[PDB]
Design a binder for this molecule. Structure first.
Ligand code: ZN
Length: 197
């Protein structure tokens, strides 16, 4: 399948992602490494991602998330749940069982299977920040381990977040690598040490 662009693009509204500072304790379920631009998270745990804009986009703007393989030799392969997890009885009523990425706690989430590329994505309406806040947050879940056989199979993935208008045209784009693993704090520490070495 053709490969979606991963080029960072702030666009007219100054769109970019942000992440909370969670640390690398053994108790951490989700931690983001700025040095690696990489999120480490446990299976099906809440991953809060901040959406930042310099100016408010029009009503009907939406935010889409999609996973692609990071490595050149695999980026044409659709990222999907492995044969085991796609048959898990863990439906939330909205997400198709094949989709790796879910949005948690948003009843207006929509899930797309692209008719031409067959890629999966999940999209929600963009909303203005609440009273007293400067950004909005989306809660994502990753429903397969990076290591799952017959699925990601230890291959790294990227999540691409796109800001879109009501027709789906591109307004902004940002991305981050993801590792879904049992011990995100330990793995983030290891990979940051390797990068230093
Ligand atoms: Zn799996």
């Amino acid at each position: 399948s053709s490969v979606p662009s991963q080029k960072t693009y702030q666009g007219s509204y100054g769109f970019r992602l942000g992440f909370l500072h969670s640390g690398t304790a053994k108790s951490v379920t989700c931690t983001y490494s700025p040095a690696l631009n990489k999120l480490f998270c446990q299976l099906a745990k809440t991953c809060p991602v901040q959406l930042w804009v310099d100016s408010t986009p029009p009503p009907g703007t939406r935010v889409r998330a999609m996973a692609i393989y990071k490595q050149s030799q695999h980026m044409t392969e659709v990222v999907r749940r492995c044969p085991h997890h796609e048959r898990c009885s863990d439906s939330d009523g909205l997400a198709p069982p094949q989709h790796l990425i879910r949005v948690e706690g948003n009843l207006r989430a929509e899930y797309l299977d692209d008719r031409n590329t067959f890629r999966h994505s999940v999209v929600v309406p963009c909303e203005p920040p609440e009273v007293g806040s400067d950004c909005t947050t989306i809660h994502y879940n990753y429903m397969c381990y990076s290591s799952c056989m017959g699925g990601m199979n230890r291959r790294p993935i990227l999540t691409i977040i796109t800001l879109e208008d009501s027709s789906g045209n591109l307004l902004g784009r940002d991305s981050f690598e993801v590792r879904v693993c049992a011990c995100p704090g330990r793995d983030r520490r290891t990979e940051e040490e390797n990068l230093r070495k």
